[PDB]
């Protein structure tokens, strides 16, 4: 992982999906779409996804955020939330044209952007086309400073 740089999970596992729904949508009507938040939060929310290494380096992404904490102790992550996002899995993108800008914009803050898609799968197993391992997923992207 090289900073500056977006990366998503292609095919994320939630170990909880409606607690982690639950959470995420509480925090979303409590703290809004796009704030700044503690380094053990983000850890805490990131600890609810099991994805493949290969696909999504959450291990090494963590490990860089605790870096910041010892170094900057102050230095918050940025985080933004989205709903009702309509994207089907394995089409190699996730994000829209405002959130590619306003991730190539932040050069400050960690940055984790969250996706939350439902009501997709039904058409693409229908039609024996890939789908998310749950309706609704939420799916991650990250972006570490530099």
């Not at 596992?13 to 503690?38: F, P």
């Not at 870096?67 to 993108?93: C, I, S, W, Y």
């Not at 994000?95 to 960690?110: F, G, I, K, N, Y």
Request: proline share 6%; net charge neutral.
């Amino acid at each position: 992982l090289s900073g500056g740089v977006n990366y998503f999970a292609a095919d994320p596992r939630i170990k909880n999906v409606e607690a982690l729904d639950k959470k995420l949508l509480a925090y979303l009507d409590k703290h809004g779409e796009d704030s700044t938040i503690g380094m053990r939060a983000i850890i805490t929310i990131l600890n609810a996804f099991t994805v493949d290494p290969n696909d999504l380096d959450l291990a090494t992404f963590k490990a860089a955020l605790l870096d910041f904490e010892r170094n900057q102790p102050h230095l918050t992550a940025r985080m933004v939330l989205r709903t009702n996002r309509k994207v089907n899995q394995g089409t190699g993108a996730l994000l829209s044209p405002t959130d590619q800008a306003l991730s190539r914009a932040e050069v400050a803050h960690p940055l984790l952007i969250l996706y939350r898609i439902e009501g997709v799968n039904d058409a693409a197993a229908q039609r024996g086309e890939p789908t998310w391992s749950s309706d609704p997923i939420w799916v991650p992207n990250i972006k570490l400073p530099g």
